[PDB]
């Protein structure tokens, strides 16, 4: 799976 | 009782360590810290009581999520409400946390191919699941599709959820943008409608920007129109109302605006599979299960691991008809097995 998300 | 931005929520001593996420008509749902199980929580306040459809809508997603159990649809972990009739004003649902949604993160973020790639894998497993209970969400839009930090995304609000087994959603009050062109020309109950507004999600997550951003039912229409241009007589001859067909008939002629000048840097296969989803022709449109298949999220696809519901979902009682007071009883007993 692709790398993590950044929120904001 | 710890109050968030103006709202009671009597949740505790369980569930602690409140923060505003988002809101509807008639709920607000923040982030918590469960208490007993040691792991933070969604939280849903829902405060239907007062009106006939928010109860419809409100049976209906409990029921429904209640039933279904799939990693891509949001789950029922805990309901809590008064211990009597009376009492109960309003309803507490605790689900797992999903940090985000869909709509906030192209808000604030675009998407990379791998991203798009592996959500609409997701979005297509969890209808996969909702489709082979002979169940249509009709509501599919990017908010309504929840994410968390590590991708994980689950298909939540079954409101307006129909079974497919003989309501009408242009009498409802809510967005339009990804509904199908068949909605519009009056007619909003086969599986394909789900897979047009998936078509739409696509579209969204390769721009950032909603598709067909209707105002209205034949703005909406227009706004379909105006991209995959005039429909060919062959599917003319599939509109079963004859006014709706006429009237498209005579509307002048739209070209087609080709997929790949609408997303410039969309993969070719994803486009493909675009063009498959947002078909004018409901019966030419292309199934749950062969948009799995397809090309485009060959990467993701595994049948084997692809979970189908072992029974068609079925509601025991119409809904639509029933007074609110008679609603609320029936929400009283479904939420009777989460009390001591």
């Known amino acids: ?8 | 009782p710890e109050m968030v931005r103006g709202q009671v929520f009597d949740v505790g001593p369980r569930y602690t360590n409140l923060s505003y996420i988002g809101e509807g008509a008639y709920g607000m749902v923040c982030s918590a810290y469960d208490n007993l199980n040691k792991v933070r929580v969604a939280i849903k306040k829902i405060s239907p009581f007062e009106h006939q459809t928010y109860c419809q809508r409100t049976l209906r997603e409990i029921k429904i999520l209640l039933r279904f159990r799939h990693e891509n649809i949001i789950g029922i972990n805990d309901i809590i409400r008064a211990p009597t009739i009376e009492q109960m004003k309003d309803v507490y649902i605790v689900q797992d946390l999903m940090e985000t949604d869909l709509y906030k993160l192209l808000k604030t973020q675009h998407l990379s191919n791998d991203h798009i790639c592996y959500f609409l894998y997701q979005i297509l497993r969890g209808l996969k699941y909702i489709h082979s209970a002979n169940v249509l969400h009709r509501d599919l839009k990017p908010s309504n599709l929840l994410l968390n930090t590590t991708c994980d995304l689950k298909i939540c609000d079954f409101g307006l959820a129909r079974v497919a087994d003989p309501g009408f959603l242009t009498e409802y009050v809510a967005t339009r943008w990804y509904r199908a062109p068949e909605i519009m020309l009056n007619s909003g109950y086969t599986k394909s409608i789900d897979i047009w507004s998936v078509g739409c999600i696509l579209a969204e997550m390769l721009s950032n920007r909603p598709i067909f951003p209707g105002k209205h039912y034949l703005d909406q229409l227009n706004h379909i129109l105006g991209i995959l241009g005039s429909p060919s007589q062959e599917d003319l001859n599939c509109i079963i109302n004859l006014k709706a067909r006429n009237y498209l008939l005579s509307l002048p002629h739209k070209n087609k605006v080709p997929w790949n000048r609408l997303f410039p840097n969309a993969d070719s296969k994803a486009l493909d599979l675009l063009d498959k989803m947002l078909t004018f022709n409901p019966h030419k449109r292309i199934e749950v299960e062969q948009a799995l298949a397809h090309p485009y999220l060959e990467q993701y696809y595994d049948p084997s691991d692809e979970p189908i519901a072992e029974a068609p979902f079925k509601f025991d009682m119409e809904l639509d008809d029933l007074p609110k007071e008679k609603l609320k009883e029936l929400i009283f007993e479904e939420t009777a097995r989460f009390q001591p």
């Open chain 1, 1 to 8: 799976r692709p790398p993590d998300l950044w929120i904001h």
